[PDB]
Structure 1
């Protein structure tokens, strides 16, 4: 079966104000491209082409000016609104229609992943047609996240959203794969105390049925989020140092669509033209004549 993708890019701007008074978080660039390009690329890497972008009323159209219908890139992009930041799990209600009876995946708009064989990392959750899959990453500050505890032999046994007393240092990252059950599970949720329809609650509903797979995203991968002013800067220096060392870009959607045969040489050259004066255009052009392994 076919899997559809959602990017949740909405949310409170009150935190990063006044920095984000003119531009919301996921519309800011990370080094040399819009934040949203990173998670989008994530979904492309997992082989997903039909993607729903959920944002604030005010931001939806911006994302549409930026990305279009996605046909330029071999994608089918649609848009929906989150009237109010009332929980990541609402994504499934906003998207019920878009999901239909298909499998799905959700990624958070400010989640930036980097590393080797992200294809094989995703591939495996991608292929599971029953149940749900999530990824755990070792962090310094687990209490800011959904936290997954494991027993002595490695199996996940508990989940807790932002525990005052975390049971482990493994955070659940902002990338989740679901089967056809997810929308009915979300339907039944009641808001937590902190006023939110919790993605941790969905994931636990699968876990309590023995249907939650928890994969380790190893320390050789970099999972960054653009939470704060200090974190955005580190994410920018991190992308800059890789890009400048390699002369290759991270998370360039045009490149990915081309590597995946979603667009052809000819399509890519058309994308390159209007960018020809700058480095991003120059990059795309180099890609039609260079083999990159």
Structure 2
């Protein structure tokens, strides 16, 4: 072999019957947060990290619906592929479903219902994606760490334990649903035995890296918003939050067409074509405005 890449995965799985009847009509990650499908937010997040080749994993039934929404990604300078997940057998199954997609490359895994926002988010992601070996996760202070993977730190700020959804959390630092992995993750994932609750657990993957001294735990500061979108109440809260920001600024959070344009993955002519069919609504008008307005 001769030399002359980091690939993305969005787990947009079946949310069961938890949000029914809202979700009888459509899968969770197709429901909007304010003005855009939920999946726009994690997609935009991977895009901000510089990732163009992205696998979307969803149920057999939802796959064609995501495909209708997003296509192959080529209109936005992306290469979107799709894989079906028959059964909800944990998040780490992503690496077995996505094995041939990842191949010998670096990877990033993001949850389809996580929403992130803040200043220099691009730089926070960039430094995780820059580490070409080991694994990188983000820790975020929350009120309810028991709902998440929880990280414990020693007095010098070094991570010393990870626990999946502990009933007695060692700290208030939750591991966010955005993970950066090197080439070892698939082989780590293949050795996972399902948990007491019958799932292949992402926390076990992360603990394998930690045990090898190869896990970076970066703090995602309190000046960032990490919002969850998996209850009716939290989905509503997330929409209000985005609406308040966007209406204040006259700028959008997680507009994929914008992010592709600013990454130079598409050019001004291409953005104009995307603006055309959306011209009679605010979204297409927004895209048109980006062709002439300097936004810092």
Q: Quickly name the TM-score band, shorter chain normalised.
A: over 0.9
- Which structure 1 segments of 5+ residues have no match? none
Return the offset for 1:12.
2.6
**1:57-116: CA deviations, max 9, x gaps?**
110110000000100000000000111100000000000000000000000000000000
- Partner secondary structure for residue 15 of structure 1: coil
Give the CA deviation at 1:193.
0.5
Task: Say whether the 8 Å CA contact 1:139–1:169 is kept in structure 2.
Answer: yes
RMSD of aligned residue pairs (Cα, Å): 0.5
1: CA distance, partners of 2:253 / 2:199: 33
Residue 172 of structure 1: CA displacement?
Answer: 0.3
SS in 2 for 1:164: coil
State how far apart, in whole Å, the 2-side matches of 1:279 and 1:103 are: 37
- C-alpha contact 1:13 1:25 (8 A) present in aligned 2: no
Residues 144-173 of structure 1: CA deviation (Å, up to 9, x unaligned): 000000011100000000001000000000
Aligned residues: 292
Q: Which runs of 4+ in 1 moved over 2 A?
A: none
How far is the alpha carbon of 1:13 from its aligned partner? 2.7
Separation in 1, partners of 2:13, 2:76: 23
Q: Judge conservation of contact 2:106–2:181 (CA < 8 Å) in 1.
A: yes
Q: Conserved in 2, the CA contact under 8 Å of 1:13 and 1:24?
A: no
TM-score (norm. length: structure 2): 0.98
Matched-pair contact (CA < 8 Å) for 2:15–2:28: no
Specify the alignment match of 2:150 in structure 1.
147
1:14 Cα offset (Å): 1.0
Query: In the TM superposition, what is the alpha-carbon distance from 1:11 to its structure 2 partner?
Result: 2.4
Q: Aligned equivalents of 2:138 and 2:150: distance in 1? A: 11
How far did residue 18 of structure 1 move?
1.2
Distance 2:135 2:261 in 1: 29
**Match for residue 74 of structure 2?**
71
Q: Deviation string for 1:186-237 (max 9, x for gaps)?
A: 0000000011000000000000111000000000000001020000000000
- SS of corresponding position for 1:14: coil
Instruction: Render the CA deviation track for 1:243-290: whole Å, top value 9, x for unaligned.
Output: 000000000000010011000010000000000010101100001010
- Within 2, Cα distance between the matches of 1:291 and 1:98? 37
Secondary structure of 2:270's counterpart equals helix
